Design a protein around this motif. Sequence first.
Motif, PDB file in Angstrom:
ATOM      1  N   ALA A 127       7.539 -10.013   2.487  1.00  0.00           N
ATOM      2  CA  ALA A 127       6.383 -10.843   2.105  1.00  0.00           C
ATOM      3  C   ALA A 127       5.645 -11.243   3.408  1.00  0.00           C
ATOM      4  O   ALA A 127       6.314 -11.616   4.388  1.00  0.00           O
ATOM      5  N   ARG A 128       4.315 -11.040   3.451  1.00  0.00           N
ATOM      6  CA  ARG A 128       3.586 -11.328   4.703  1.00  0.00           C
ATOM      7  C   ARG A 128       2.086 -11.499   4.426  1.00  0.00           C
ATOM      8  O   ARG A 128       1.650 -11.223   3.315  1.00  0.00           O
ATOM      9  N   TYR A 129       1.297 -11.942   5.423  1.00  0.00           N
ATOM     10  CA  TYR A 129      -0.162 -11.919   5.249  1.00  0.00           C
ATOM     11  C   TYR A 129      -0.626 -10.554   5.714  1.00  0.00           C
ATOM     12  O   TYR A 129      -0.280 -10.130   6.819  1.00  0.00           O
ATOM     13  N   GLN A 130      -1.410  -9.874   4.896  1.00  0.00           N
ATOM     14  CA  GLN A 130      -2.007  -8.601   5.305  1.00  0.00           C
ATOM     15  C   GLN A 130      -3.454  -8.947   5.754  1.00  0.00           C
ATOM     16  O   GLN A 130      -4.178  -9.665   5.021  1.00  0.00           O
ATOM     17  N   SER A 131      -3.841  -8.547   6.951  1.00  0.00           N
ATOM     18  CA  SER A 131      -5.173  -8.829   7.482  1.00  0.00           C
ATOM     19  C   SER A 131      -6.174  -7.735   7.087  1.00  0.00           C
ATOM     20  O   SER A 131      -5.756  -6.606   6.704  1.00  0.00           O
ATOM     21  N   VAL A 179      -7.705   1.858  -1.151  1.00  0.00           N
ATOM     22  CA  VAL A 179      -6.818   0.999  -1.940  1.00  0.00           C
ATOM     23  C   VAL A 179      -5.502   0.779  -1.168  1.00  0.00           C
ATOM     24  O   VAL A 179      -4.933   1.726  -0.628  1.00  0.00           O
ATOM     25  N   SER A 180      -5.036  -0.454  -1.138  1.00  0.00           N
ATOM     26  CA  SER A 180      -3.805  -0.789  -0.438  1.00  0.00           C
ATOM     27  C   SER A 180      -2.912  -1.735  -1.250  1.00  0.00           C
ATOM     28  O   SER A 180      -1.699  -1.745  -1.060  1.00  0.00           O
ATOM     29  N   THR A 181      -3.503  -2.520  -2.195  1.00  0.00           N
ATOM     30  CA  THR A 181      -2.673  -3.403  -3.034  1.00  0.00           C
ATOM     31  C   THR A 181      -3.185  -3.382  -4.513  1.00  0.00           C
ATOM     32  O   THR A 181      -4.292  -2.896  -4.792  1.00  0.00           O
ATOM     33  N   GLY A 182      -2.409  -3.969  -5.413  1.00  0.00           N
ATOM     34  CA  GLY A 182      -2.794  -4.019  -6.812  1.00  0.00           C
ATOM     35  C   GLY A 182      -1.998  -5.022  -7.597  1.00  0.00           C
ATOM     36  O   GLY A 182      -1.367  -5.912  -7.004  1.00  0.00           O
ATOM     37  N   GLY A 183      -2.008  -4.836  -8.927  1.00  0.00           N
ATOM     38  CA  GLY A 183      -1.291  -5.671  -9.881  1.00  0.00           C
ATOM     39  C   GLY A 183      -2.121  -6.842 -10.348  1.00  0.00           C
ATOM     40  O   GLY A 183      -3.058  -7.244  -9.655  1.00  0.00           O
ATOM     41  N   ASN A 184      -1.773  -7.397 -11.508  1.00  0.00           N
ATOM     42  CA  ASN A 184      -2.412  -8.581 -12.080  1.00  0.00           C
ATOM     43  C   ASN A 184      -3.923  -8.425 -12.440  1.00  0.00           C
ATOM     44  O   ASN A 184      -4.626  -9.431 -12.517  1.00  0.00           O
TER      45      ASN A 184
HETATM   46  N1  LIG Z   1      -0.221  -3.130   1.097  1.00  0.00           N
HETATM   47  C1  LIG Z   1       0.991  -3.403   0.645  1.00  0.00           C
HETATM   48  O1  LIG Z   1       1.717  -4.258   1.155  1.00  0.00           O
HETATM   49  C2  LIG Z   1       1.430  -2.636  -0.591  1.00  0.00           C
HETATM   50  C3  LIG Z   1       2.564  -1.644  -0.272  1.00  0.00           C
HETATM   51  C4  LIG Z   1       2.974  -0.847  -1.523  1.00  0.00           C
HETATM   52  C5  LIG Z   1       3.284  -1.787  -2.680  1.00  0.00           C
HETATM   53  N2  LIG Z   1       2.168  -2.723  -2.915  1.00  0.00           N
HETATM   54  C6  LIG Z   1       1.480  -2.842  -4.064  1.00  0.00           C
HETATM   55  O2  LIG Z   1       0.577  -3.645  -4.185  1.00  0.00           O
HETATM   56  C7  LIG Z   1       1.862  -1.935  -5.231  1.00  0.00           C
HETATM   57  C8  LIG Z   1       1.134  -0.570  -5.133  1.00  0.00           C
HETATM   58  C9  LIG Z   1      -0.370  -0.726  -5.286  1.00  0.00           C
HETATM   59  S1  LIG Z   1      -0.692  -1.180  -7.009  1.00  0.00           S
HETATM   60  C10 LIG Z   1       0.608  -2.292  -7.414  1.00  0.00           C
HETATM   61  C11 LIG Z   1       0.532  -2.867  -8.682  1.00  0.00           C
HETATM   62  C12 LIG Z   1       1.412  -3.871  -9.040  1.00  0.00           C
HETATM   63  C13 LIG Z   1       2.357  -4.309  -8.150  1.00  0.00           C
HETATM   64  C14 LIG Z   1       2.465  -3.715  -6.906  1.00  0.00           C
HETATM   65  C15 LIG Z   1       1.617  -2.675  -6.528  1.00  0.00           C
HETATM   66  C16 LIG Z   1       1.849  -3.547  -1.745  1.00  0.00           C
END
Ligand code: A1B29
Length: 139
Positions: free
Chosen positions: A86-90, A118-123
């Motif tokens: 778990a961290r802050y992503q800049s 794209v680098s993150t997701g969910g919710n």
């Molecule tokens: N930039 C990161 O730290 C990423 C690394 C891979 C995992 N991360 C996610 O957000 C994943 C894939 C993208 S879509 C997704 C939908 C629901 C929950 C989780 C995820 C975080």
Amino acid sequence: SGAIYVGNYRVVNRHLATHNDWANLVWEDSSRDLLVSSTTAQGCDTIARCDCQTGVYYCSSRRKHYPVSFSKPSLIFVEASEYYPARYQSHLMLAVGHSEPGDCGGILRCQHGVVGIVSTGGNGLVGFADVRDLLWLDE
Ligand SMILES: NC(=O)[C@H]1CCCN(C(=O)[C@@H]2CCSc3ccccc32)C1
Ligand SMILES: [Zn+2]
């Protein structure tokens, strides 16, 4: 999956970089989830140099492009995953949109060129790693 190809550079999500990306490493930043490697063939993508907050991104889990309004690049808390604690992503920008595992690497583009990937997701959210500040990609 997905990458940006500009000049002799390949920009990928750092957590998806291959053995070949690391063997030809130019720059990487764990706090941004970005890695850039060098390439022998010439890339033709254009990088935006702007402050747009609207664009279109490619969502591989729907085989579709979606228009989005996105926040300015900032430090955002990201939950622990198998790739990072778990961290802050800049330099991260959020938008309301679909994104699930497998969607990282989809390009976000405005009228000026490539904005980020794209680098993150969910919710019902999608996060993009900005690349517009990397001016050296064009030299
Ligand atoms: N930039 C990161 O730290 C990423 C690394 C891979 C995992 N991360 C996610 O957000 C994943 C894939 C993208 S879509 C997704 C939908 C629901 C929950 C989780 C995820 C975080
Ligand atoms: Zn723009």
